């Protein structure tokens, strides 16, 4: 089966245009290189603003004190590239979807990045799988 979770908030206008910007690859200042135990070093491009507004860990990692060169590459480990992609899709669109067997990895990633909404969603999903 497949589970999903959608959220509605005050940024219903900004998130859509920021996601369209991300799909256009025009303005980007964050580069994430995800690796997981054999996976290709998946390279995602995204803005610091949405990642900081959706996770406090990204905000803490983006406050390095000096961002003169603009583009920054942040290598991420311990998470599968698909899970990170779904997390970024939730950060940009306020909506996430997952398979019934990938809920645990999404919940682990969300707890690692402290995204309470999808954390509670995945907790409810894992409870409903009994």
């Amino acid at each position: 089966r497949t589970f999903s979770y959608t959220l509605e908030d005050h940024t219903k206008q900004a998130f859509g245009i920021m996601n369209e910007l991300r799909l256009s690859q025009q303005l980007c200042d964050v580069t994430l290189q995800v690796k997981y135990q054999d996976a290709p070093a998946a390279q995602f491009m995204a803005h610091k603003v949405a990642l900081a507004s959706s996770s406090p860990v990204f905000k803490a990692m983006f406050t390095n004190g000096l961002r003169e060169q603009g583009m920054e590459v942040v290598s991420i480990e311990g998470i599968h590239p698909k899970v990170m992609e779904r997390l970024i899709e939730f950060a940009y669109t306020a909506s996430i979807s997952m398979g019934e067997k990938c809920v645990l990895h999404v919940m682990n990633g969300a707890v690692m990045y402290q995204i309470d909404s999808v954390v509670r969603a995945c907790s409810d999903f894992l409870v409903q799988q009994l």
Partner: protein, 372 residues
């Protein structure tokens, strides 16, 4: 009119005002004179170069020996043999930079330390399989080091750090992030052996207040990065700000025990404090009020993700702080956005930074080339 009549220095400057693509594909094909001019080299930047060189590294190493800085950024193609031969062919290397080269082992840095002792800047991305033995090689051979960066190098223990601290007395910069197995012993050995230190950072390391308090011996500290660090009490950073009077940038993000009294003491005794970051610090408006009323030098303050920040604290810090130009009001949900709009409308030279404000700045930069 003849361009070739100009001295070659002016022509070199004009070609330096040209990008690499326009110089190698257009300028080098105009004439043999411009070819020889653009062919002239020193500092080379090979940042990520679509990972298109393994043997070309050895070719350019055997070509010229007059290289002072090498940028090996993210560089997934070449192996350790190219780095070894490049170190063999470049003894006069001053700056070494290779980020996120997770395929390089410690043999490369061993050969580097063995064949270029004049290193001053060494910036080493994640680069797994970096043992302390090649790090003690670097510490015992490159005594002329000034800048050192080991970001997220989980394979480093305290032995290599203490060996680095013993030598390299001219180390002015040091930065380590999320590097476990590195504890207060390394910080203590670094603080009491290298008084030339100005920039220091132990973010995410297994460092406690016992190691941070030893940084008072460094009266030349300019920037301090202590983000997500294990249990740093207020008294330690109080003594740090009191002793280190040259402290300009203080980073205390992800520290759930720093209170507003500590911020007040830091603002009072921070006669040279210029940048203060307090993201996720469990503080309240009293910290901002103290920064505004007592600190006449803080320009950048960041209180992002602080739960108890409200409109009144930000209004008072905008009214009472004369040197403030950047307010880090990120994700302060208890802060009204209309208040922030009024602030940005009736307070110039202050860039209030919230979620909606930064989104609006990015949206204006995008609407300059707008779409739908």
């Amino acid at each position: 009119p003849d361009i070739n009549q100009l001295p070659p220095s002016i022509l070199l400057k004009i070609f330096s005002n040209l990008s690499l693509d326009e110089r190698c594909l257009s300028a080098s094909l105009v004439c043999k004179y411009w070819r020889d001019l653009c062919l002239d080299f020193k500092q080379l930047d090979l940042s990520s170069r679509q990972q298109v060189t393994d043997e070309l590294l050895e070719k350019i190493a055997s070509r010229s020996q007059n290289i002072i800085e090498i940028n090996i950024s993210d560089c997934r193609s070449m192996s350790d043999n190219g780095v070894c031969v490049l170190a063999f062919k470049c003894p006069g290397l001053l700056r070494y930079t290779a980020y996120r080269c997770k395929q390089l082992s410690d043999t490369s840095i061993i050969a580097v330390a063995s064949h270029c002792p004049l290193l001053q800047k060494v910036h080493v991305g994640n680069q797994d399989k970096l043992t302390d033995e090649g790090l003690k090689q670097l510490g015992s051979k490159c005594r002329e080091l000034k800048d050192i960066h080991f970001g997220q190098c989980y394979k480093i223990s305290d032995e290599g750090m203490i060996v680095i601290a013993k030598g390299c007395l001219k180390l002015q910069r040091i930065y380590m992030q999320e590097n476990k197995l590195v504890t207060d012993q390394s910080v203590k050995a670094f603080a009491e052996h290298c008084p030339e230190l100005q920039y220091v950072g132990f973010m995410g390391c297994s460092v406690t207040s016992k190691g941070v308090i030893h940084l008072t011996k460094l009266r030349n500290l300019s920037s301090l990065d202590l983000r997500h660090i294990t249990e740093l009490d207020n008294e330690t950073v109080m003594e740090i700000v009191k002793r280190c009077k040259n402290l300009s940038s203080l980073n205390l993000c992800l520290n759930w025990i720093i209170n507003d009294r500590c911020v007040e003491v830091i603002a009072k005794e921070g006669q040279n404090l210029k940048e203060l970051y307090l993201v996720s610090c469990k503080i309240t408006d009293y910290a901002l009020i103290a920064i505004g009323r007592y600190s006449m030098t803080i320009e950048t303050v960041d209180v992002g993700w602080c739960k108890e920040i409200t409109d009144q604290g930000a209004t008072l810090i905008a009214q009472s702080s004369k040197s403030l130009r950047y307010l880090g009001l990120m994700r302060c949900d208890k802060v009204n956005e209309v208040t922030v709009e009024q602030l940005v409308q009736q307070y110039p030279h202050i860039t209030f930074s919230t979620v909606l404000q930064d989104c609006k700045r990015t949206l204006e930069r995008a609407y300059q080339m707008g779409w739908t």
